[PDB]
Amino acid sequence: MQMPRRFNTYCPHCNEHQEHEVEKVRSGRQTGMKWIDRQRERNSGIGNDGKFSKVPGGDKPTKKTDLKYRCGECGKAHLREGWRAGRLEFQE
Amino acid sequence: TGAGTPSQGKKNTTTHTKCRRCGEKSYHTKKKVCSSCGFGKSAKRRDYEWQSKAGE
Amino acid sequence: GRRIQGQRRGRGTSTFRAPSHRYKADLEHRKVEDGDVIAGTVVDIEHDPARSAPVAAVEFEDGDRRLILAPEGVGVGDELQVGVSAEIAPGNTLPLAEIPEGVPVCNVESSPGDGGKFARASGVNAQLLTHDRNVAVVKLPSGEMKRLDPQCRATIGVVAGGGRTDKPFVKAGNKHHKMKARGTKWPNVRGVAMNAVDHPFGGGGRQHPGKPKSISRNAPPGRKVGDIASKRTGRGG
Amino acid sequence: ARSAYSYIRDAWKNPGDGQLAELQWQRQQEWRNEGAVERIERPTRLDKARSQGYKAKQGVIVARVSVRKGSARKRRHKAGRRSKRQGVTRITRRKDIQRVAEERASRTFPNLRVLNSYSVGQDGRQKWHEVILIDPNHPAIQNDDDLSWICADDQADRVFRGLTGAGRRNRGLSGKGKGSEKTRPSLRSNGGKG
RNA sequence: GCUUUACUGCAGGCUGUCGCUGAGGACUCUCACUCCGGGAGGAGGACACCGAUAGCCGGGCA
RNA sequence: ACUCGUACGGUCACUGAAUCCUGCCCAGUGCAGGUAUCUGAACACCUCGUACAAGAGGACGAAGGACCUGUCAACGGCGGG
RNA sequence: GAAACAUCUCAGUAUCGGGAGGAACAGAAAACGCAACGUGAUGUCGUUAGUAACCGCGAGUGAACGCGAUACAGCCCAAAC
Ligand SMILES: [Cl-]
Ligand SMILES: [Cl-]
Ligand SMILES: [Cl-]
Ligand SMILES: [Cl-]
Ligand SMILES: [K+]
Ligand SMILES: [Mg+2]
Ligand SMILES: [Mg+2]
Ligand SMILES: [Mg+2]
Ligand SMILES: [Mg+2]
Ligand SMILES: [Mg+2]
Ligand SMILES: [Mg+2]
Ligand SMILES: [Mg+2]
Ligand SMILES: [Mg+2]
Ligand SMILES: [Mg+2]
Ligand SMILES: [Mg+2]
Ligand SMILES: [Mg+2]
Ligand SMILES: [Mg+2]
Ligand SMILES: [Mg+2]
Ligand SMILES: [Mg+2]
Ligand SMILES: [Mg+2]
Ligand SMILES: [Mg+2]
Ligand code: NA
Ligand code: NA
Ligand code: NA
Ligand code: NA
Ligand code: NA
Ligand code: NA
Ligand code: NA
Ligand code: NA
Ligand SMILES: [Sr+2]
Ligand SMILES: [Sr+2]
Ligand SMILES: [Sr+2]
Ligand SMILES: [Sr+2]
Ligand SMILES: [Sr+2]
Ligand SMILES: [Sr+2]
Ligand SMILES: [Sr+2]
Ligand SMILES: [Sr+2]
Ligand SMILES: [Sr+2]
Ligand SMILES: [Sr+2]
Ligand SMILES: [Sr+2]
Ligand SMILES: [Sr+2]
Ligand SMILES: [Sr+2]
Ligand SMILES: [Sr+2]
Ligand SMILES: [Sr+2]
Fold first, then answer.
1. Domain, as residue range, for D144
2. How many domains does chain C have?
3. Which residues, other chains included, contact C46 with Cβ-Cβ below 8 Å and sequence gap of 6+?
4. Fewest CB atoms less than 10 Å from the CB: which of C50, C135, D150, D187?
5. What is the rounded distance in angstroms from the CA atom of residue C152 to the CA atom of residue C84?
């Protein structure tokens, strides 16, 4: 489906309607220094490694929209519940 | 030739004999080792914890 | 499953051992300091159980009675020489350096002084081709060009008993008598004829190796069976 | 002023540099041709021996012991085991090589008791340690105020029960506080979790 | 119990790397170390063996 | 252990005396060889990060793989129209 | 056991190798960290506490400091000269 790159809507930070810009959330890189990372190194060794021997699952036929709604005035963004969209293209 | 009665007739070999060290008829005269006390195998006496129940 | 036969062998139990207590002697070259003044007389010709070929008993000058890896043409009464200054004749032993090019040799040493390693079986011979101050090139019975130290000792002539392989055993019993004189389990039961538990090729209604026979060089023992690291198979191509 | 001993000590701080490097390169050729346990007349590291209790007295023996280098020499499981108890290659033993060396020495000298030991190097395939043993039955020792303690009955086969300094360190008894909850007073009494 | 391109691992083989290991992306040397030799000595050589680790193969095995 | 053995040897497999014979297929799988280029770990090295360290990235790249080749008395195949 | 099962559990249990004693082991701080102007070798008992911590964060596993008791005891080398 199509969607406007920018549109007026409620900004929970300004507490009033402002023009927002929508952007698909890009995955941030991991640091490899979180507790889980250390548990992987600690609990992995010889033989089976329990949960760390499991390999990541599959995919759903369609994914929900993953977007950031950034307010045009204060520059702060906010998240929203996503909806299943086979494809999401922006207008402008 | 069956493995039972007919094969029992061929048994006239002496193996286990009275042991010089413990007195039991367990000294294997061919191996020269006592299956009971371990004479001929070890200076120490043959003994095992599994010879009794674990907590006794 | 169960360890296959090839693994049982390694343990070196009675069934797989050679009848060593029945063997005569290792036909190694004599150890001479120098001067070549070591010659002897062939006192008798004997059968060697380990190689199914004749071997010669020699009585050397210094009083040493030893069995020798005999080439063809050696007979009782004949005098044999061993050393640097030995005469270039059949049955004589001397380093490759002293041997003239284009002369059939046998019982060739791998490393000077080892006593002989190459070309020792019935009828075979190595061929001394190229000479040098640093390396003697010898063609082995397998057709391989082997570079050796010119100081390696060897016996002039081909090994006695040639043509042994030319007559068929004809019957199982004949093979039997020969195998009793070797370190080998015989007869041979095909892998495909055993149960799945006993060999990689066992099992399945009709007999057939349920997999390709060409096995990798890296395969572990128990799996390394069939055609070991074959560069090719068949007769064509 | 600095003792003569301090120089032997300082040399041994960097066994791969200076004169010591050449000494070791020479010696090891001879050591490699020696047995598992060779009694020596004098310690190779005098300062260390004297520091550990050595004395140029009757009843004091020093022996060099060599042990194969690396991990455990373990036989793979015959019967079934969970992947966790299947490993064979990376598993190492709980006793350090120095401790193995001390025991081999004491066994060679059944009447003697291990006093202490120290390292004297290693090559790519083995390690060497010199063990100081004492004769608890010799009067020159029963009369020594600094060593007569080793003559007591409870000191018999002390090395086999982990009473040596290397034994105690290996059992995790170094720290008196944090970290020694499962080591003191014994590994066994703490359920062998140390 | 058995099979395999089932899951997960383990031996084993191959391969790189670090230690053993020295002197003057290709090389020479000898002194460790290895092999042959009764010995003298010869061959080889910082490689190989061995310890450690990494990647690949891995129903041979659990 | 084989081995007091050395290719006329002995190891690993298949077929199963003699006689007359043994066609076609290397695409897949297996084995083996080669390989410009692609891919390919760790150590050391370089960039960022941390007064350090964790960590991120880079360069180089072994076997292996991709790719090419050889091979069926190698696993096997030799149909429908 | 986890109602399968691989980490985990059963368990450092059964069993094996070595060794001492009447008891063993531990033990006079490179401690503790109720952070203090505080405690003062070590065992053990009660408690702290199924607490902190661990863990397919599942099933389960699981201390310590301190406190109240028991008994109390502190010393010897190496080196300097
Ligand atoms: Cl989206
Ligand atoms: Cl034959
Ligand atoms: Cl002792
Ligand atoms: Cl306190
Ligand atoms: K289990
Ligand atoms: Mg011979
Ligand atoms: Mg036989
Ligand atoms: Mg057959
Ligand atoms: Mg059958
Ligand atoms: Mg099988
Ligand atoms: Mg068939
Ligand atoms: Mg040798
Ligand atoms: Mg299985
Ligand atoms: Mg058939
Ligand atoms: Mg048949
Ligand atoms: Mg269960
Ligand atoms: Mg746990
Ligand atoms: Mg206790
Ligand atoms: Mg569950
Ligand atoms: Mg626990
Ligand atoms: Mg605490
Ligand atoms: Na840990
Ligand atoms: Na002793
Ligand atoms: Na069954
Ligand atoms: Na094909
Ligand atoms: Na259950
Ligand atoms: Na079950
Ligand atoms: Na767990
Ligand atoms: Na209080
Ligand atoms: Sr761990
Ligand atoms: Sr693992
Ligand atoms: Sr799906
Ligand atoms: Sr029968
Ligand atoms: Sr009988
Ligand atoms: Sr015995
Ligand atoms: Sr016992
Ligand atoms: Sr020989
Ligand atoms: Sr010899
Ligand atoms: Sr089959
Ligand atoms: Sr053909
Ligand atoms: Sr004793
Ligand atoms: Sr035929
Ligand atoms: Sr092919
Ligand atoms: Sr007190």
1. 1-194
2. 3
3. C24, C54, C55, C56, C57, C67
4. C135
5. 11
CB < 7 A to strand F: residues 33-62, chain A: 33
Full set of structural domains in chain A with CATH: 1-92 (3.10.450.80)
Block residue for tokens 């090994």: C159
Number of folded domains that form chain D: 1
Indicate the SS3 state at residue A30: coil
How many A from CA of D80 to the centre of ligand 27? 15
**Domain with C32 in it:** 1-78
Task: For residue C147, count other CB atoms closer than 10 A to its CB.
Answer: 11
Q: Is B19 annotated as a binding residue?
A: yes
Q: Could you give the dihedral angle defined by the CA atoms of residues D160, D164, D165 and D167, in that order, rounded to the nearest 10 degrees?
A: 10
D113-122 β-sheet, strand order: D37-40, D60-68, D126-134, D113-122
Q: Could you tell me the distance in Å between the CA of residue D105 and the C1' of nucleotide E47?
A: 36
Resolution to 1 decimal place, in Å: 2.5
> Rg of chain C's alpha carbons, rounded to an integer?
22
Which CATH number goes with the domain that contains C70? 2.40.50.140
| D186 burial type by CB count under 10 A (0-12 exposed, 13-18 middle, 19+ buried) | middle
Work out how many CB contacts closer than 8 A connect A with D.
15
Instruction: Give me the residues paired with residue C227 across strands.
Output: C214
**Do the Cβ atoms of D87 and A48 come within 8 Å?**
no
- Closest residue, by C-alpha, to the C1' of F72: C234
**One domain for residues C216 and C182:** yes
Question: From residue B36, how far is each of B4, B13, B22, C232 by CA, in Å?
Answer: 28, 20, 8, 60
Contact C77, C41 (CB under 8 A): yes
Sign of the CA dihedral running A59, A60, A62, A65: negative
DSSP C16-44: GS--GGG-----PPP---SS---EEEEEE
Binding residue per annotation — A82? no
Contact A47 D86 (CB under 8 A): yes
In a shared domain, residues C171 and C227: yes
Chain D and chain B touch, per 3+ beta carbon pairs within 8 A: no
Chain D residues near residue A47 by CB distance under 8 angstroms: 82-87
Residue D105 belongs to domain with CATH number: 3.40.1120.10
Domain boundary among C159, C180, C212: C159
Fill in the DSSP letter of residue D32. Answer: T
DSSP assignment of D146-178 = TTGGGGSGGGTTGGGGT-SHHHHHHTT-S-SST
**Same domain, residue pair C13 and C31:** yes
Domain boundaries, chain B: 1-56
Which of C78, C110, C144 finishes a domain?
C78
D16 SS3 class: coil
- The CATH code belonging to domain B1-56 is 2.20.25.30
- Residue C40: phi, psi to the nearest 5? -155, 175
**Closest C-alpha among D17, D133, D9 to residue D64:** D133
Same domain as C67, residue C2: yes
